[PDB]
């Protein structure tokens, strides 16, 4: 994926609810630092839904690609309000950005 393009997608569609940086604040949604290789619902100090806590998958390219296409289909009852990103290339660019930003 294209990290520069992924950043712009993130700013447009995600940043109002999420931070990525180490020590970044929770906002409407959890800070995403450290997501890759972590099970759902594991950002410390955030009130997740039981739906998000209970999904039980491990975040990575494959599961993000699916989630981000249609978040509520993947995690019904999530409190994340975001309809999804249809395009595969856009999702891959976004995920590439997250893989960098959430591990710096
Ligand atoms: C607010 C209006 C949000 C927008 C826009 C996006 N997200 Fe979100 N996200 C939000 C909340 C409130 C939550 C918690 C949901 C719950 O049911 O408890 C989330 C959760 C996620 C997660 C899961 C985190 C985890 O399991 O630790 C991810 C991976 C995620 N959000 C990513 C994400 C991306 C990449 C976004 C733009 C495409 C995006 N979210 C938008 C709130 C909001």
Domain ranges of the chain: 1-104
Ligand 1 centroid–CA 61 distance in Å is 15
Residues after which the chain is broken (C–N above 2.5 A) are none
Ligand 1 pocket, residue 81 CB under 6 Å: yes
Query: Read out DSSP for 6-74?
Result: HHHHHHHHTTTT---STTPPP-SS---TT-TTPBTT-STT----HHHHHH--B-SHHHHHHHHH-HHHH
8 Å CB contact between 60 and 54: no
Cα–Cα distance for residue pair 104/98, rounded to 1 Å: 10
- Please name which of 27, 19, 6, 11 lies closest in space to residue 79, comparing C-alpha atoms: 27
> What CATH homologous superfamily does 1-104 map to?
Cytochrome c-like domain (1.10.760.10)
DSSP 8-state assignment for residue 76: T
Write out the two tokens for 53. 């806590």
Experimental method: X-ray
- Please name which of 48, 46, 54, 82 lies closest in space to residue 67, comparing C-alpha atoms: 82
8 Å CB contact between 98 and 64: yes
Is 65 known as a binding-site position? no
Write out the two tokens for 2. 């294209």
């Amino acid at each position: 994926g294209d990290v520069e393009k992924g950043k712009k997608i993130f700013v447009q569609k995600c940043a109002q609810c999420h931070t990525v940086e180490k020590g970044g604040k929770h906002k409407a949604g959890p800070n995403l630092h450290g997501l890759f290789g972590r099970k759902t619902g594991q950002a410390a100090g955030f009130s997740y839904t039981d739906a998000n806590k209970n999904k039980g998958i491990t975040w990575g390219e494959d599961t993000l690609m699916e989630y981000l296409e249609n978040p509520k289909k993947y995690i019904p009852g999530t409190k994340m309000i975001f309809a999804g990103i249809k395009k595969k290339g856009e999702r891959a660019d976004l995920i590439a950005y997250l893989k960098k930003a959430t591990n710096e």
